[model samples]
Target: TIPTTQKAVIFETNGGPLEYKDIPVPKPKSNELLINVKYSGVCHTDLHAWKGDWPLDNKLPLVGGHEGAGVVVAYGENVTGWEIGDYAGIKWLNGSCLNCEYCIQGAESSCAKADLSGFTHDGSFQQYATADATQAARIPKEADLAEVAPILCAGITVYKALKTADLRIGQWVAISGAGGGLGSLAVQYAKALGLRVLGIDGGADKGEFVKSLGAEVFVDFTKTKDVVAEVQKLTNGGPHGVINVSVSPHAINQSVQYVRTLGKVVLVGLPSGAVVNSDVFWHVLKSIEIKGSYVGNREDSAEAIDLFTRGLVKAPIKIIGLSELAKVYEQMEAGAIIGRYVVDTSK
Candidate 1:
């Protein structure tokens, strides 16, 4: 039921050409599953990989993508608890050493020997991809592959950050860069979790867009002279927690200034060599905590996808042919995308 050759987009070097051509299909390893990827969501991390922006170097000549939704076509001898034709997803954390200290504590993302999808390993930019059995996502049978694709990464990410922020029901949580793909999903998840949402971004339609997704207020950063003051005023002395999904170091620092006393600031976006500053006097006085949230573990993934299945959350997606992935990256670099973009491999 599988072909010997498949179509894929590959890059030979950092910031090199994205060549779409025929490539040999990959076989599943002993602890892996061969998934027939139908749809894959393009994430910012993929852009970072292509540009070699992050400190972590990607596998050269890599197939860069992590948000893939597909059906398991085959498995290896050591694979278990999975069956053929079951829906599966490719996540950022492709695999990890299960016995490591971090993995033992259910923090597989921090595992020292972690194999990253689209980064350290060949990922789901092709028609067929092999993923570690233990780290592959267990998607619901009835879910739409394209619609749920972003959930594999973006949804799980923001959901994990919300958990790290630890805001109470009815409290306020501000989403920086609320108009982008991750920020938009963060707004929905925060609302579904019973917290008030303050979306911060700059765009004509973004104000209404985030509000449509249940955000109480939208602060247009492009128009605001003092973002910190405006966010504090709108949320009544600042939100109880801030999810800094924005990639700007300045915006991250603004969150530190405006957050309420004892609030938590969760950093999720990876801006290249970006360092945020906090005033020591105010930091001690407010007692605000700054935390970093990476991608989620299996439990977080299940919960995030369940929220999507129950119609509590959604990924606004624009579908295109896989060959046009480079165009998506161009738009991503320019900050032109409002939501997620998914690519159809068959196209």
Candidate 2:
């Protein structure tokens, strides 16, 4: 049996301050399982919810967190093969209707009825949370909960975005914003998958950080007079593919010009109302493809967690208590965060 009430972070209205208060722990439906969330990673999407910039409607008085790691404390009536004390993780794609065409094709992330964590539903910034048993990630027993927390969302998202580029082994893939949370993970994932990585970001520290992740080349945007030409020079004929992990409008526009002939551009970051300008004539003549990658599906999530377990991908995270989320949000607004931030519920 689960407790009736648990501590959670709630915001009454958009732009309101986050309040850590006692809210009723939710009960799992027949297909859901109740997880005792030990740690939750704070993401930029939480800030979007606090600001209400997107077109989608969010749950009011919402619990805002998605990348959570914890133990399965209780299973709903019909949930099977899962027992108490099993380790699990909650990702951005909480659940999706399995009967849709997208789900049938193993692309559940594109399903129209997909349920998002920390956006459209109650999320992981709580003592106990609920997730669909089928969609919950099975984490390895020996993994660090705090370190693995961010991988549930950021790690999986970047890995899927990289895969969407359709680049072969040994080919160069340019990762924009290659020093931040998602970019760092993308560099590691690309390296582990046998692809050459070209990291594009600003500052000397960021270049060193990208190099630490095994990137073959690091392009410091601050120092480079022309980023596109510099990337093209480094990769001979530009990169085979580009993964635009950063949401800067200019970066998105530049990706098309920097890609090789028949190259693909994969977009993962969400910038509210940001537009990407592409010349239709050039796009058609060059045969370059532009694809949008959302969060990963169940298979993608499982593969990402496997890489984390095998020590191939390291998601550097700073652990903080749940009560300190407000401060983390402030740092994010000021563009001061280094890597990902994970929140320990017990604190």
Candidate 3:
């Protein structure tokens, strides 16, 4: 029962009012799938789309969401390997020209013509949305829509960041901000990857939460006397790698310091539209590596799914109705959220 129109959340411009009203249900193109987005996971990135704070411009009058989990209701011509009633996910990496060198190398995130669902293209803030068939995530039928929504973005992202670290089994991998959504997932993935986990965050409760997620050690930044020295001391000359999920400018600078000799420090978060700048002076002495890790490709997404399928990964989330998206953004702006907030379309 495809309707001609549907209820959707839309914004005309950055810092604009979010209007939840009826809009025309759009048709998919030759290579897209029209999914009835059941639940969308709210991310800090969505706040970027709503606020238009990033260096890249978003499509105006946009529906902002990418971590959407749903079922395929319709498809355009020329699509394959998907059918009506099949589960799917609309991730951050929407589509990229498959013929580009980057895509050929399975690095579609680097492709110049890359399309992002919540940024460059109209996204899934509506009940119905379209996604590229090639890039849309395959969600397992057994998975919970609301629970799986967060993994569509936050899980795949941290898993890709762990892979970028390239650490071997039993090596220490420190996750900065290990209590929040991304950090918690990072801890789980690192443990699944056979890496020793060190979680860095603030407060006693957060530290307890991080450890309960499989991190072997916890560093409370709020109580630490010397952040860098404490991290290095805890992990024996620092961890083999560091995942900068915190993105605090101070945390970013400290990551470079606590990574062991010849270790890799991967930057995963995009906080404050900030940059990670450090001197090449000590950069060479330790032979350390600094890399920027964005979202993952289809292969990485598949691998992350396999982890979840094996019952080795999970995400904690808070479910809210689509009508409450404004409140979600308000809390996101104030940096007050526990785990992830998922939007229930039916509400």
RMSD for each of the candidates: 1.6, 1.5, 1.3
Better structure of 1 and 3 per lDDT: 1
TM-score for candidate 3, please give it. 0.97
Stretches off by above 4 angstroms in model 1 are 333-339
lDDT tens digits, residue span 167-261, model 1: 89999999999987789899999988999999999986988889899999999988899999998998888899999998788899999999998
Residue runs of model 3 more than 4 Å from their true location after superposition = none
Q: What RMSD value applies to candidate 2?
A: 1.5
Q: Count residue pairs with overlapping backbones in model 1.
A: 0
TM-score of 1: 0.95
- What would the per-residue lDDT of candidate 3 be over residues 1-347, giving only the tens digit for each residue? 98989887888989899888888988999999999999999888889988988888689889889999999999999999998999999998889999888999989978999899888887878899999999999998988888888888889999999999999999999999999878988999999999999999999999998888889999998899898999899998999999999878888899998899999999986777577777798899999999888888999998997788677888877888998888888888897565578999877
Global lDDT of model 3: 0.89
Kindly report which residue pairs in candidate 3 clash with one another: none
Q: 2 or 3, which is superior by lDDT?
A: 3
* Candidate 3, position 102, lDDT: 94
How good is model 2 by TM-score? 0.96
> Evaluated with TM-score, which candidate comes out highest?
3
